[PDB]
Each structure stands twice: as structure tokens, then as C-alpha cells.
Design an enzyme around this catalytic site. Structure first.
Site, PDB file in Angstrom:
ATOM      1  N   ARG A   1      12.365 -12.056  -6.252  1.00 37.72           N
ATOM      2  CA  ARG A   1      10.961 -12.120  -5.822  1.00 37.72           C
ATOM      3  C   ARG A   1      10.006 -11.857  -6.987  1.00 37.72           C
ATOM      4  NH1 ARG A   1      13.494 -11.764  -0.223  1.00 37.72           N
ATOM      5  NH2 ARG A   1      15.564 -11.607  -1.231  1.00 37.72           N
TER       6      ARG A   1
ATOM      7  N   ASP B   1      14.834  -6.969   6.384  1.00 39.71           N
ATOM      8  CA  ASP B   1      16.218  -6.779   5.929  1.00 39.71           C
ATOM      9  C   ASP B   1      17.116  -6.176   7.011  1.00 39.71           C
ATOM     10  OD1 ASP B   1      14.982  -7.061   2.989  1.00 39.71           O
ATOM     11  OD2 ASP B   1      17.052  -6.866   2.780  1.00 39.71           O
TER      12      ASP B   1
ATOM     13  N   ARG C   1      18.088  -8.822   9.465  1.00 36.73           N
ATOM     14  CA  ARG C   1      19.169  -9.598   8.843  1.00 36.73           C
ATOM     15  C   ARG C   1      20.436  -8.746   8.940  1.00 36.73           C
ATOM     16  NH1 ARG C   1      15.532 -11.408   4.918  1.00 36.73           N
ATOM     17  NH2 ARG C   1      14.152 -13.069   5.730  1.00 36.73           N
TER      18      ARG C   1
ATOM     19  N   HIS D   1      13.487  -5.318  -2.057  1.00 36.64           N
ATOM     20  CA  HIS D   1      13.640  -6.665  -1.491  1.00 36.64           C
ATOM     21  C   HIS D   1      14.529  -7.451  -2.458  1.00 36.64           C
ATOM     22  CE1 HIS D   1      11.337  -9.464   1.440  1.00 36.64           C
ATOM     23  NE2 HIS D   1      12.458 -10.052   1.093  1.00 36.64           N
TER      24      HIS D   1
HETATM   25  N1  LIG Z   1       7.292 -10.036   3.859  1.00 42.72           N
HETATM   26  C1  LIG Z   1       8.279 -10.955   3.816  1.00 42.72           C
HETATM   27  O1  LIG Z   1       9.330 -10.674   4.375  1.00 42.72           O
HETATM   28  C2  LIG Z   1       8.129 -12.277   3.122  1.00 42.72           C
HETATM   29  C3  LIG Z   1       9.203 -13.059   2.941  1.00 42.72           C
HETATM   30  C4  LIG Z   1       9.025 -14.261   2.301  1.00 42.72           C
HETATM   31  C5  LIG Z   1      10.208 -15.159   2.085  1.00 42.72           C
HETATM   32  C6  LIG Z   1      11.462 -14.325   1.766  1.00 42.72           C
HETATM   33  C7  LIG Z   1      11.434 -13.011   2.528  1.00 42.72           C
HETATM   34  O2  LIG Z   1      11.606 -11.924   1.631  1.00 42.72           O
HETATM   35  C8  LIG Z   1      12.535 -12.974   3.547  1.00 42.72           C
HETATM   36  O3  LIG Z   1      13.513 -12.161   3.402  1.00 42.72           O
HETATM   37  O4  LIG Z   1      12.496 -13.755   4.559  1.00 42.72           O
HETATM   38  C9  LIG Z   1       7.787 -14.643   1.864  1.00 42.72           C
HETATM   39  N2  LIG Z   1       6.739 -13.821   2.069  1.00 42.72           N
HETATM   40  C10 LIG Z   1       5.384 -14.165   1.628  1.00 42.72           C
HETATM   41  O5  LIG Z   1       4.689 -14.801   2.689  1.00 42.72           O
HETATM   42  C11 LIG Z   1       3.548 -15.514   2.132  1.00 42.72           C
HETATM   43  C12 LIG Z   1       3.257 -16.726   2.994  1.00 42.72           C
HETATM   44  O6  LIG Z   1       4.030 -17.853   2.535  1.00 42.72           O
HETATM   45  P1  LIG Z   1       3.626 -19.321   3.026  1.00 42.72           P
HETATM   46  O7  LIG Z   1       4.188 -19.567   4.373  1.00 42.72           O
HETATM   47  O8  LIG Z   1       3.985 -20.309   1.985  1.00 42.72           O
HETATM   48  O9  LIG Z   1       2.035 -19.197   3.124  1.00 42.72           O
HETATM   49  P2  LIG Z   1       1.566 -20.270   2.033  1.00 42.72           P
HETATM   50  O10 LIG Z   1       2.064 -21.612   2.409  1.00 42.72           O
HETATM   51  O11 LIG Z   1       1.933 -19.797   0.678  1.00 42.72           O
HETATM   52  O12 LIG Z   1      -0.024 -20.220   2.206  1.00 42.72           O
HETATM   53  C13 LIG Z   1      -0.660 -21.160   3.091  1.00 42.72           C
HETATM   54  C14 LIG Z   1      -2.149 -20.887   3.154  1.00 42.72           C
HETATM   55  O13 LIG Z   1      -2.509 -19.895   2.150  1.00 42.72           O
HETATM   56  C15 LIG Z   1      -3.857 -20.089   1.750  1.00 42.72           C
HETATM   57  N3  LIG Z   1      -3.895 -20.137   0.263  1.00 42.72           N
HETATM   58  C16 LIG Z   1      -3.104 -20.859  -0.584  1.00 42.72           C
HETATM   59  N4  LIG Z   1      -3.383 -20.686  -1.838  1.00 42.72           N
HETATM   60  C17 LIG Z   1      -4.435 -19.780  -1.826  1.00 42.72           C
HETATM   61  C18 LIG Z   1      -5.202 -19.175  -2.849  1.00 42.72           C
HETATM   62  N5  LIG Z   1      -5.006 -19.413  -4.153  1.00 42.72           N
HETATM   63  N6  LIG Z   1      -6.173 -18.320  -2.477  1.00 42.72           N
HETATM   64  C19 LIG Z   1      -6.364 -18.090  -1.179  1.00 42.72           C
HETATM   65  N7  LIG Z   1      -5.722 -18.585  -0.144  1.00 42.72           N
HETATM   66  C20 LIG Z   1      -4.755 -19.439  -0.544  1.00 42.72           C
HETATM   67  C21 LIG Z   1      -4.362 -21.369   2.411  1.00 42.72           C
HETATM   68  O14 LIG Z   1      -5.079 -20.979   3.569  1.00 42.72           O
HETATM   69  C22 LIG Z   1      -3.058 -22.064   2.794  1.00 42.72           C
HETATM   70  O15 LIG Z   1      -3.200 -22.967   3.876  1.00 42.72           O
HETATM   71  C23 LIG Z   1       3.910 -15.717   0.661  1.00 42.72           C
HETATM   72  O16 LIG Z   1       3.078 -14.890  -0.134  1.00 42.72           O
HETATM   73  C24 LIG Z   1       5.348 -15.219   0.526  1.00 42.72           C
HETATM   74  O17 LIG Z   1       5.673 -14.692  -0.749  1.00 42.72           O
HETATM   75  C25 LIG Z   1       6.934 -12.782   2.631  1.00 42.72           C
END
Ligand SMILES: NC(=O)c1cc(CC[C@H](O)C(=O)O)c[n+]([C@@H]2O[C@H](COP(=O)(O)OP(=O)([O-])OC[C@H]3O[C@@H](n4cnc5c(N)ncnc54)[C@H](O)[C@@H]3O)[C@@H](O)[C@H]2O)c1
Ligand SMILES: NC(=O)c1cc(CC[C@H](O)C(=O)O)c[n+]([C@@H]2O[C@H](COP(=O)(O)OP(=O)([O-])OC[C@H]3O[C@@H](n4cnc5c(N)ncnc54)[C@H](O)[C@@H]3O)[C@@H](O)[C@H]2O)c1
Ligand SMILES: NC(=O)c1cc(CC[C@H](O)C(=O)O)c[n+]([C@@H]2O[C@H](COP(=O)(O)OP(=O)([O-])OC[C@H]3O[C@@H](n4cnc5c(N)ncnc54)[C@H](O)[C@@H]3O)[C@@H](O)[C@H]2O)c1
Ligand SMILES: NC(=O)c1cc(CC[C@H](O)C(=O)O)c[n+]([C@@H]2O[C@H](COP(=O)(O)OP(=O)([O-])OC[C@H]3O[C@@H](n4cnc5c(N)ncnc54)[C@H](O)[C@@H]3O)[C@@H](O)[C@H]2O)c1
Lengths: 333, 333, 333, 333
Positions: A106, A166, A169, A193
């Protein structure tokens, strides 16, 4: 007569528009929508706000939401862009398309991140300076203290997230492997993570809260079955699924919904997710990281401190350290 | 001892796995997921299945779903691909990426469509030949009778959809314009889906079920305010939002969720969506199209027939005709 | 035209009335109503039946229920008296005004009880001989095997209840005393229902599933605080409240609702409540009593066997024995 | 270490206990409990209070409630007696055992009533002087203006209730007779509560919001079927059921729950229940009585004014008058 239908605005109290409550998402996108649905669906809005640095998707996105309108009970939802409206609040959450890197560990970073989060946050906080923030973005720790700090109030406002995820999972697969139930059964993880993520085998139990240690007899990696392999696979589980991503979102958001639900309502419960690390289990400096804790009314009140101390202790301990170590340098807006 | 924890499979009844019920989506994608969430969220699964002619997204998509697991109560959900599993059922729904055309008049076609729907459907039906099908794809009418026909049982199994959607659109804005409430208030539309979509001004009322005709006094287009413009805008509303699409889904699916909820449980209620057109308001041939009706236990039981007869009658009437007219030729697998 | 409004019965499928599922209560009274509400309220009826050897209350009782109608979504609920209707089913429950004795040790009896339960049960079973029965009446054990036996199928159909209740009691107060949360936290009880009721201090933990033994350091009765007094008080807690009774019902029913919810849907979870005692922790004869176990689809599949063995083992063990001992004689319809 | 488990109170924010919201019932009894369940069950408590001029039942009543605890998510509920605690609030409701008379025309009185309501109310209002009150007791009108008046703020705080109830009655049976659905379908009543209760046949419709007048052709009492008899029966329906009473409660409370739900959340919807009578359909003096209206955030905002004018108008009109007429005298604390 004329105006339309009987009476006119006043007649009782009058001109005003008072929700009582209110909330918002800066993930109007995937996580956003995933979040939105869970939220618009469960039961939480006395008043709801949604927004981003997007004009388009916004327009379109809300339309489906707004239209659903009559299917869910949430009177009002506002769309617009910058950070004035949302004020009316309590819980607010930001993602910001950058997220991962698409491959493994990450986002080591915060660097070009400071930027992405800042011009969004310091805006919202002023308007509803009286709220709590759910910050998500790889190293939850990293940003929680980043948001909290530049933002406003240590362990009262800053809640990272991680962990519950986690655990889930950890639990389902295992449980299923074990041969059991969705709901009961138990056991946790500590730390961050992935690329360390350390579990507690010291309490893993089944619909009792008795003990699976006395039975399946200890050792991990000297037995084949592969308890060890199990948790690794999981990390991988969180990992690979590189073919499809925003489904990390489905669940991710779901989890966040669970958390917020938990936090919003005030259950005095228990949830990992990184906050303060000062209960009384001393941690090397600022500290930062997870540890199961209880959330409520304004943010959190109390974290749960402890474990065995067999390397795993170090496992957990050392990770946090090593990064800040280098972060020290890397950190500085 | 050894196996793990106390007891072993039997002890009571035994080896089996009996849901009672079950359901599925062929929109594992947008509509699919949108559907999934609404569904996985509301409260409906005693047993649930999800699938498509996709291997990848599937893997990824379910992961988020499956993981959420502990946040929602739905014991089991199966993923795999072809059409064997799902059998265990009642309600099944197919989309199939083709959908619109991205511009205007919903897919005049069925041509290359016959293909897209067929190799999916005739599979599912055999396995759970005892179900009802929610067919979505532009001209709901067109396919409902297409699915129903090649599929199996007229007004018992085939339910198009549309309408509820248009009503929602019709209602919220208007209501809001009017100056009122989300829930109560009322008035409908008849026919198809855009480029005609005809409303009933003969019953439009407000939190009474009284009359807005006696008041705001009749005429449409000879008054400025523009009641007329209002419904057109709406069609446009459904229309343009070309910038963002799968949010048609958010609501679309939401609506479908509402319908299924309605249908699954057996409320004997009322919902547009095109079925039979033979109540006793004679319609030119096979017929096909909407008309408010009531759904339940096996599909639908009773449609609601009527209106004024001022051109609008024709408006509604003629559309269906004109297409079959040409369709006649175009239709033939 | 004439009949009323458009169409007439057929038009699609036709004459039939098929719920799919269905359920019932013989506690149309307190527990009954308490049950009813929880049930009519949560989300469970695809089809519901209610009834007793009462004509009056019935009439009146249902009226409030039936009227609520539009506030909850449960299409159909039947009232009448004997045992024909209800058939359509799965889960059925009987109370039967006799219940306690108003003073202490839950109804040692079965004597004049055999009568009260029998002329009700053997009726219902024939009609929906394909169900599971939730039997409540003081010594749950006693009747479970009584119902099961005369009724039909050991550990597949007979589920007593108890336990979850005692746990709740055990947990809330304690937790509150401890200083914590409603939801997480844990630890159980074993055996029967008062005048013995034995808890497990071997697993009592807090929002971890770690250990409170290592800490607050063992002993009970040699420490003042009075862990011991704590569980006793609880038994008393279940006890006294002689001033007000049918509120035993509020919760009692609530609990039962939880159980049924659990059982009805098929969560493969965990719940005390006395079933079989043959997992593989040998118990003196027919046996009967509780032990945490998992319920699903047809009744239960698997009980959870174990403990320390320090007198408490005997505590638990011996109670069951002593009664059957004397019961032997007392038992015989 | 010592205190118990890791950390100690502070660690983040600190000492406080802030719900945000809160509510209460003075019907700790039947209606009370009925209310309680619906409420404790649906989804509404961020914080809840319950109480009366009862010491006993209270103790017992709460026990079942409190214990259920772990089955429903409502962190805190307080019991005690007088009127200090509850303060923390918004919505509060009082019944007060007197209620009916057990025979016919709902309590003409207010006389010995003034007493029963007063020593309870003026207490609660001071503590949470910032709320809205749901007053129930036969002639809802009578007391609403009584409570409102001595209490504090006309159409902002005082909401009677009635109507929704009568509608329900009006609707289910009829609908069922008609041959239809629970949810859709429509038509209302105006005025008070029995011995007049006047319905509107001017809008009675079916899953359309079209018209049943054009069809089943007008007249009432000159046709046999007996539309007339229908509504009378209903009044009787509300009436007789003298065999069983507190089931008036089941539904009564259910209805109230619906209302509160409606009011608490802020849906801007529609609900009868007597408030102000000054929209702009002039009514003879203080006025008081029902009329469909919309509730929200602080109480109500807007009532819906109108009808035909054929005696029924008078029917509705005159009742209110005649009583105040005599009430004039009878009224005076
Ligand atoms: N907390 C978690 O568990 C988590 C997990 C994961 C994946 C792996 C995880 O560890 C797990 O085990 O499953 C990812 N994330 C975080 O979630 C964020 C959201 O990801 P997303 O679904 O991809 O959202 P996005 O598509 O990036 O964003 C879409 C919208 O964001 C805004 N946006 C985009 N760019 C910008 C900007 N520069 N400034 C402001 N707004 C926007 C706009 O409104 C878009 O429509 C992600 O952070 C991930 O890491 C968290
Ligand atoms: N009923 C409606 O109201 C409706 C409305 C709309 C938009 C306008 C509407 O009239 C309104 O007023 O709002 C659209 N639709 C129909 O919904 C379908 C779903 O659209 P989608 O969100 O675009 O789903 P998708 O992305 O096409 O499909 C994604 C998944 O579909 C499967 N898939 C794709 N191609 C194929 C295939 N060739 N064979 C089998 N499966 C797939 C795979 O699993 C994908 O992941 C859409 O039909 C639209 O018209 C209905
Ligand atoms: N499972 C439990 O936890 C439980 C607890 C308690 C109280 C103490 C408890 O251990 C605790 O820790 O909280 C009591 N019960 C059992 O619940 C039964 C219901 O009691 P109730 O509320 O008193 O119901 P009721 O008023 O007896 O019965 C009312 C209706 O019963 C029917 N009925 C009455 N008599 C007869 C008859 N002879 N034949 C058929 N039907 C009826 C009629 O329909 C009545 O309206 C109770 O058993 C209690 O022991 C169970
Ligand atoms: N709004 C309605 O629709 C409604 C209907 C009905 C019945 C007929 C109805 O018109 C219909 O169509 O269905 C009745 N009510 C009113 O509900 C009140 C509740 O009646 P209840 O169920 O009888 O409650 P209760 O038993 O009187 O009261 C029990 C508790 O009240 C407290 N209490 C009792 N006496 C006093 C006192 N003197 N001071 C303070 N508290 C108490 C104690 O806490 C009791 O445990 C009822 O008003 C009815 O008219 C309303």
C-alpha cells in the site's frame, strides 16, 4: 386560492430547514457510491450530503441516487462542489483517486499525497469544524495522524479504519475452512495493512470464546495444514485481485459503512482501525497504528491493550517503527 | 477428538444444504452490483446466486461482496459460470452489455439482441424452469414477449419493468417544484420508455388523492408555467445524462430491487412495467407495453385498465402499434 | 365492465394463494404478542399464522395486529382456532398459560403439564408435520425431549431455548459493571435455568476474545468484589421480578425472536438452548440440557462440547442427573 | 495495571455522555410497551428514555426491555420517576390510564382529565422545553389544544393523532373486500374519532389514483352493497372490540410509532391527526380537529385543505362546533 394546494408555508412554525445531524462523502465515486448505497440503504440519514472536485460524474451519479429517492427514506441530499454546503455535519470521509499503486505494498507515500488530501480537507473542517473524520488511503496510520494533526484534535477526530477488514478476511475463509457459522466465532489481527499484518492466534476461538489452542495444538508452519499459509494467503487475498479493483470498494465501503454505523449511533463497541497508541502499552513515539478499540458519540473512547510477547509482539511493534524511522525525513508539509 | 471442535456433521439431522427460496443476477456488473447491493442490503436472501459470461470481474466482484459477508446477513452466495448452479430459484434477471446505444431512442433493436439474451436465458430457465424473469433492455416490451415466448408462460413469468422509473422521475421533481413530500403525493405514466412516454394528468394529485385539476386549472402548453415542458424535460432527464451512465444503474437497479422486493414477497400491490395487455381494454394484437398492475407469488395477477380518451389515449395506443408494425418484419429468430 | 376495476382474477397465472414458508404462535397472549411484535416487526413473514384455544382475546388481539397491517409488510395473517390452518409451515411455538408457579424453582413439573401441551401439539404436527418446534416452559429440557419424543424426530425438531437468556443477563450487567460495550465482549453459562445455572469463567473476556483471567486474577468468593455474588444476583435477577411478570416475556419473546430469526434464516451460528447431549462428551442417559450449539435450515446441526473440570463440571453434570433420577418415576403419559 | 482491561476512561476525548437526540414514553404500560417495542424495534434510538408515576411495573417492564438489549441496537435506556431525566429530548408522549370509559363515545371529558395530564406534562416540558408532544386520549382535538395551550406553542408542538388509524381501518377491510393490495390503493376520512367520523368518497381510488366513482357509480345507501354500512361497521370496528382492549394499543401504538417515525426523521409527508385549522378553509373559532397534513423537523409544516360540500362538509364541520359549544362551559382549569 391560486398558489396551488391549501395553506402556504407558515401555518404552525415556519421558514427554516433543520435536519439535526447530517453527513458526507468525498468518494462520490466507487468507494463513494459503494459507501453511498450501503449508507443510503441501511438507515442513517436525517440529512445527507455528497461531493467532490468533480462536476460531471456528480451530476450523473446523484441522478440515480436522487431518483431512487422514493425507494429509500432519506428526505434530503445535496450535490455541488467545493466545501461550503456539507458543513451541516458530524461524520465526513475522503478518499481521493490515487489510492494504491495497483501492485503491492500500500502507498508507502504521503508525498504527493499531502497535496491530494489537503486542498479538500482543511475546507470541510472549517465549515463543520465539529466532526470526526474517516480517512482512508493505504497506510491508514500515516494519514490519520496527518489528517488529525493538520486537521484538529488527536484521538477525538481521527479514525483510520483498516483492521475490521483484515479480521473479516481472516474470519470467513478460516471459519468456512473450519466448517461453521457466519456470525459467531472469533479472533484478531494487529498493526497495519499487509506486508506484516500480524494476527493473534492467542485468542482464535469458535462459537464459545473458549479455545482452539488447547485442541488443534499450537504450532504454525510445523504441521502442514498451514495455519501460517492461511493468514499469508489472506494478505495475498487483499493483494492480487488486481484483475478487479473497485470491488475492494464494495467491501471496503461496506466495512466503512459498518464503522460509521457503529460510530454514528454510539454503540460503545469495539473496532480496530488505528487511533492513539497511548492506552498504557507504551509505543515508540508519536506511534500510530491500530489495536482493537471502542467508538462512540464524538469519535472514540478507549482502546484495548495486549498480547503474548513471542516475536509476534515484535512483529507488530517493529513495523510501525521502521517506517516512521524513514518517514521522519519524508514527512513535512 | 482431533477433527477440531466438538461433534461432527450429523448430530440431529445431517448432510444436506437446503435454502428454501434463492435468487440471481446476470448483471454481475453495474446494474448487477447496483442490484446486488440493494438486494444484499435490504433483506431478502435465504439463499443467493450471482453470475455471468465473465470469469474475471466475477472473481473480483464477489470478493468485495463475499467479504462484506459479516456486515449483512445472507449466509450463502455462489459464483461460477454457465448456468448450472443458480437453478435453486424463483427470481432471475439478465441485462447483457449492449443496453442502449449511448444517444437517444432506446435500442430500436432486438436483431443482434436475440443473440445476446438467448445463449444466456434458455440455459437458466431449464435449471430453475420454475421461476419468473425480470428482463431489462431498452424497449422492455419488445423483449418481455421475446423472453416470455421463447422462454415459457405469458403473464406468469414475463415482467418488463419500466414505468415505476418514469413515475419516480415524474414525481420527485414535480413534487419538489410543487413544494411537498417524498412519500405521499401522486400520478402516473403509460406506454413505453421515451419518445412518446405519455403521462396521465387525469389523476395527478397531492397528499389527498383529491384533485389538482380543479385547481391549477387544466391546460398544458397554453399557460406558460409549462406542465408540458415538465414531462418532456423528464424524458430528457432519463435521456441526456450521457456524461455519466451506470448511475442510470444506481436508480435503475434500485427500482428493480423495489420491484423484486415487491414481487418476491407477495404484496399484491401495484407497479407498471409491461406484461399482458388483455385485461379488457382491447389492444391491437399481441400488444405488449405497460399499464399499472399488481405483482405477487408467481409473477403477476391483474393489470389496471384505463383513461380519458383525448389524443393521449391515441398517444399511448399508437406507439406500441407503429413499432410492431415494422417489427413484424424485424422479428424472427 | 361492472365487477369493479379492470381485469378479473386470472390474466396471467390464476387462482391459488402460495406463500412459500409460513409460521406460528400459540402464545397469542403475552409471550405470544411479545413474540408477534418482534416477529411482525423485524422482517420474516412471507406468510404468518397465529392461534390458540382462545376465541376472545384472539378476536381482539389480531385486530390491533391486523390493523397495524399497513405499517409493517406482512401480507397475510390468519386467526381461527383448533389446528387446521397453521399447517402451512416450518417454525411453530407453544407456551400455554401455566408457565411458572410465581415463586422460585421453575416448574419442577410435567405432570398436569403433559396435558396442557399435548392436546395442542399433536394437532399442529400432523398438519405441518414438516417443521421444528420451539418449546418453552420452565424446565426447557424436560419438555424438549417430551415434545420431541411424542412429537417426532430428536435433534432435528426439538429446540428448548434457555441459555441465550442467561447469557444476556450474565453479560449486560457485568459488562456495564466492567465499563464497556453492548455488542462485543464475551462469556457463557451451561446447564438449565436457575438453582444451579453454572457459568464458565474459563472464557469470560472483553472485546478481544483475549483473557480477563490473566488479569483480574481468578478466584471467586475469595476476593470480595464478588464475581460469585454477580452470577447469583443474576439468577435472582431472573427470579424475583415477581412484581411484574410478562416483561419476562418482553425479553423472553425478544430472545425467542432472535433464536427463530437465527433458525428461520439458516445462519449456521451458535446458540445455547438444550437439544441433544451426544456430541461426544458423554452424558448420563437420555441426557437433555443445554450446551452452546449451531442452528439452521431444518433445526440444528452441531453442538459445542467442553470445559475445565473443577466441580463446575460436576455442578453442570449432576443437576440434569438428579431430576431425571426422580423424574424417571414422575415421567409417564 | 489493575483496574481491569487496558486504558482508562480518557485516552482521546473523555468524560461526557452525549447522545444527540433522545426520546420518551409515559405509557410504560400497554400503549407504552406496544410503543416501546415498535420503537425499540424499528430503528430510532440514538438515546432513549421511558417513565411513569409507577415504581413497580417500571422495574419489571424495563427488565425485559433492558435484557432484550443485545437483540436490538439502542445503547441506552433510562428508567426512574418524576420528570428530571427524560429532558434530553425531542419527542415525548403521554397516555395516562383513564383513556376511554369502556363503552362508546370516546371520553366526552377533560374534567377530571385536566388533572391526570397536567401533573405529568408541565414537568416534562420544562426539562426538554424544546420538543413536540404526541397527546393521545379519546378526543385528541380536545387535549391537543389543551396540551398545546398550557404547554407551549400552537401548531409547532401539538399533534393529536387520530385519523391515520381510521384510514387504516377504512382501507384494509375495504381493499380486501374490493380484492386487492396492502400497500397501494387509497382514500380518506375527516374530523374526529367515532360518532360522526366522516369519510371522503370524493377521492377513494385503487392502485391508480384514478377513480372508482366513475365506475361503481356513486350513491351510498341506495344500492344495497352498502358502502355506507361499510364505514359505519368500521366505526363499530374501532368500537366494540370491548372483549379485548390493549390490542387497540398494539395497532394504536404501531400507528403512533409510524407517526413518530414520520415526525422524528423529517420526511415532509402527510398524516391526519388534528393540529391547527387555519390553513385557509376558515373554521369556527379556536377550531381544532384533523385534516390531512405534513409533519417534520420540529412538528408540522402545512395542512391540506378541502372537499366536496354535500352535507358531508357540514357533517365534518358541525361536530367540532357542537362540542366546543358545550365545552366552552366545561373548559376551565
Ligand atoms: N480501507 C480499506 O480497506 C481500503 C482498501 C482498499 C483496497 C485494498 C484494501 O486494503 C483491502 O484489503 O480490501 C482501498 N482503499 C481506498 O479506498 C479509496 C477509494 O478507491 P476507489 O474505489 O478507486 O475510489 P476512486 O475510484 O479512487 O475515487 C473515485 C472518486 O474520487 C474522486 N476523486 C478522484 N480523484 C480525486 C482528486 N484528485 N481529488 C478529489 N477527489 C478525487 C472523484 O469523485 C471520483 O469519482 C482509495 O483511496 C483506496 O486506496 C481502502
Ligand atoms: N429498466 C431501466 O429503467 C433501465 C434504464 C437504463 C438507462 C436509462 C433508463 O431508461 C432510465 O430512465 O434511467 C438502462 N437499463 C439497462 O440496464 C442494463 C445494465 O446496464 P449496465 O449498468 O451498463 O450493465 P452493463 O455495464 O451493461 O453490464 C455489466 C455486466 O454485464 C455482463 N455482460 C456484459 N456483456 C455481456 C454479454 N455479452 N453477455 C453476458 N453478460 C454480459 C458482465 O457481467 C458485465 O460485468 C442495460 O441493459 C441497460 O440498457 C435499464
Ligand atoms: N424461555 C424463557 O426464558 C422463559 C422465561 C420465563 C420467565 C423467566 C425466564 O426464565 C427468564 O429468565 O426471564 C417464562 N417463560 C415461559 O413463557 C411462557 C409465556 O408466558 P406468558 O407471557 O404468561 O404467556 P401466558 O400469559 O402464560 O399465555 C397467554 C396466552 O396463552 C394462551 N393460553 C393460556 N392458557 C392456555 C391453555 N391452557 N391452553 C392453550 N393456550 C393457553 C392464550 O392464548 C393466552 O392469551 C410461559 O410458559 C413461561 O413459563 C419462558
Ligand atoms: N390514538 C388512538 O387511536 C387510541 C385508540 C384507543 C382505543 C380506540 C382507538 O380510537 C382505536 O380506534 O383503535 C385508545 N387510545 C388511548 O391509548 C392510551 C393507552 O391505553 P392503555 O393501553 O390502556 O395504556 P393504559 O393501560 O391505560 O396505561 C398503562 C400505563 O399508564 C401509566 N398510568 C396509568 N395511570 C396513570 C396515571 N394516573 N398517571 C400516570 N401514568 C398512569 C402506567 O405507567 C401504566 O402502566 C389510552 O389513553 C387510550 O385512550 C388511543
Amino acid at each position: 386560492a391560486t398558489l396551488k394546494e391549501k395553506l402556504i408555508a407558515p401555518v404552525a412554525q415556519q421558514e427554516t430547514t433543520i435536519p439535526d445531524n447530517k453527513i458526507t462523502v468525498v468518494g462520490v465515486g466507487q468507494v463513494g457510491m459503494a459507501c453511498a448505497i450501503s449508507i443510503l440503504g441501511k438507515s442513517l440519514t436525517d440529512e445527507l450530503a455528497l461531493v467532490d472536485v468533480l462536476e460531471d460524474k456528480l451530476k450523473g451519479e446523484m441522478m440515480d441516487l436522487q431518483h431512487g429517492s422514493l425507494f429509500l427514506q432519506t428526505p434530503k441530499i445535496v450535490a455541488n462542489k467545493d466545501y461550503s454546503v456539507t458543513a451541516n455535519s458530524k461524520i465526513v470521509v475522503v478518499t481521493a483517486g490515487v489510492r494504491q499503486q495497483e501492485g503491492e505494498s500500500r502507498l508507502n507515500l504521503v508525498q504527493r499525497n499531502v497535496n491530494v488530501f489537503k486542498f479538500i480537507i482543511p475546507q470541510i473542517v472549517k465549515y463543520s469544524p465539529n466532526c470526526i473524520i474517516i480517512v482512508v488511503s493505504n497506510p491508514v496510520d500515516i494519514l490519520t495522524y496527518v489528517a488529525w494533526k493538520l486537521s484538529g484534535l488527536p484521538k477525538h477526530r481521527v479514525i483510520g479504519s483498516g483492521c475490521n477488514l483484515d479480521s473479516a478476511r481472516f474470519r470467513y475463509l478460516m471459519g468456512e475452512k473450519l466448517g461453521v457459522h457466519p456470525s459467531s466465532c472469533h479472533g484478531w489481527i494487529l498493526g497495519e495493512h499487509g506486508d506484516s499484518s500480524v494476527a493473534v492466534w492467542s485468542g482464535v476461538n469458535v462459537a464459545g470464546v473458549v479455545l482452539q489452542q488447547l485442541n488443534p495444538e499450537m504450532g504454525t508452519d510445523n504441521d502442514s495444514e498451514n495455519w501460517k499459509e492461511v493468514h499469508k494467503m489472506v494478505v495475498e487475498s487483499a493483494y492480487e485481485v488486481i484483475k478487479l479493483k473497485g470491488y475492494t470498494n464494495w467491501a471496503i465501503g461496506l466495512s466503512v459503512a459498518d464503522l460509521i454505523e457503529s460510530m454514528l449511533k454510539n454503540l460503545s463497541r469495539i473496532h480496530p482501525v488505528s487511533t492513539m497508541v497511548q492506552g498504557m502499552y507504551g509505543i515508540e513515539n508519536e506511534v500510530f497504528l491500530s489495536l482493537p478499540c471502542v467508538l462512540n458519540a464524538r469519535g472514540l473512547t478507549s482502546v484495548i491493550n495486549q498480547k503474548l510477547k513471542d516475536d509476534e509482539v515484535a512483529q507488530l511493534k517493529n513495523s510501525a517503527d521502521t517506517l516512521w524511522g524513514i518517514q521522519k525525513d519524508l514527512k513535512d508539509l
